């Protein structure tokens, strides 16, 4: 009577667990990040349903215990049946966790691979900018090219570093949380961090490149200015000429420093402008 009912109810739960384990819960493997999102959402509702059924299972256990403790002749049979409902229910709980572990992994790995591919593609684009051979047609131009690049270097740096940090943190959350693909993920992290370090250097050398171009143009710009000032004095006081002579001494020093960096035709142009400047200066003296 209470007994007959206990059996009907036990068969019911067993049938319910059977159905969840083999037909409601799924083996599908998500194709992309989007498919994983979908599957994980569906699986968490399903897992919530399994969790709730826990109420029934406990009510059955409490009823069975009541029947055994009441000295019912089938107490042995009833307890054994409950032993089975409990086991099968715990089994269903294991299948659901495992699947959830798997979908979380598949989803994270997808998310991370998108984030990484994008950040790496980004870095590639920024390298291209750093690889510009452009040196500047004239002083006004290099001044601008150098200035624009300093701007580019700082933003590229600021924004890049934040992006790299986030991906590095995301990767550590995954590894530290324990993730079947940690080896691969770490590999990705290494590749990402190297690309970043290379880019920073590439940006840096481009800066040094433009600064050199800047000096070369600054020098030829200064020489012509000086030749004009010397000319204005000739065509024309002692204090003005002295101040000019200090600038000449200064320009000569610059010319020496630069010759050190150039050779062949350019080194000749540098030396030649120095000689021209001293020659005009002597003429004035």
């Amino acid at each position: 009577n209470e007994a007959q009912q206990y059996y009907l109810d036990a068969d019911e739960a067993e049938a319910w667990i059977g159905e969840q384990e083999l037909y409601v819960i799924s083996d599908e493997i998500p194709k992309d990040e989007e498919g994983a999102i979908v599957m994980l959402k569906r699986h968490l509702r399903q897992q919530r349903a399994v969790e709730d059924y826990g109420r029934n299972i406990k009510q059955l256990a409490s009823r069975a215990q009541g029947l055994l403790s009441a000295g019912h002749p089938e107490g042995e049979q009833i307890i054994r049946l409950q032993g089975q409902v409990d086991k099968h229910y715990a089994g269903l709980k294991d299948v659901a966790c495992e699947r959830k572990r798997k979908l979380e992994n598949m989803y994270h790995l997808f998310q991370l691979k998108r984030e990484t591919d994008d950040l790496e593609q980004w870095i590639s684009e920024k390298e291209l900018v750093a690889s510009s051979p452009e040196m500047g047609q004239d002083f006004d131009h290099v001044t601008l090219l150098r200035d624009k690049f300093r701007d580019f270097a700082r933003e590229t740096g600021a924004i890049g570093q934040e992006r790299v940090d986030n991906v590095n943190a995301f990767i550590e959350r995954l590894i530290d949380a324990g993730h079947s693909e940690a080896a691969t993920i770490a590999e990705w992290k290494d590749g990402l961090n190297e690309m970043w370090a290379d880019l920073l250097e590439l940006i840096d050398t481009r800066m040094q490149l433009l600064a050199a171009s800047y000096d070369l143009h600054r020098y030829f710009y200064t020489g012509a200015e000086i030749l004009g000032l010397i000319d204005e004095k000739h065509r024309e006081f002692e204090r003005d000429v002295h101040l000019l002579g200090v600038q000449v001494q200064q320009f000569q020093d610059v010319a020496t420093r630069l010759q050190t960096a150039y050779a062949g035709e350019k080194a000749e142009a540098i030396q030649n402008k120095e000689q021209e400047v001293s020659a005009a200066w002597q003429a004035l003296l």
């Binding site: 690889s131 250097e201 590439l202 481009r206």
Partner: protein, 156 residues
């Protein structure tokens, strides 16, 4: 020698450079060989990134990564030295290939070679290894006076 990851500045004073990541990769740009401050880049590219990689016959194999030195097409006033590590290795023969613009690969040849090294160095002091020491380390020495887009070590 100071390390680089993929790039460095060099001018007329020259300089000797090794990769921080890969000690055996070395670039020596002797004094008075580079005409201006110039930004040198050097990357080791995987062959399958190239749209046309080196054509190989049956018993041939690549023995390094592709080496991209830049700026592409740079001319020096006198030979520069590059040392590239390679894999252990057919004809137990290593050759250096170069492609100017990336589509055609030819074997690399220099006027100079082994004995001109002292002269090449222009009085700078570096120890370059025994040709036999290089063989033991599994490193090739390339003497070139310009940068092709790519260089590579192969086995024929």
């Amino acid at each position: 020698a100071t390390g680089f990851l993929v790039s460095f500045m060099v001018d007329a004073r020259g300089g000797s450079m090794r990769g921080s990541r890969h000690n055996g990769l070395r670039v020596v740009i002797p004094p008075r060989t580079c005409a201006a401050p110039t930004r040198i880049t050097c990357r080791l590219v995987k062959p399958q990134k190239l749209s046309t990689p080196p054509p190989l016959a049956e018993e041939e194999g690549l023995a390094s990564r592709i080496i991209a030195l830049g700026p592409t097409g740079a001319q020096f006033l006198s030979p520069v030295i590059v040392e590239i590590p390679h894999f252990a290795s057919g004809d137990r023969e290593l050759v250096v290939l170069r492609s100017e613009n990336g589509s055609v690969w030819k074997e690399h040849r220099s006027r100079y070679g082994e004995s001109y090294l002292d002269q090449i160095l222009n009085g700078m002091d570096e120890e370059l290894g025994s040709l036999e020491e290089l063989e033991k380390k599994r490193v090739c020495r390339i003497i070139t006076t310009d940068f092709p887009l790519y260089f590579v070590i192969m086995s024929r």
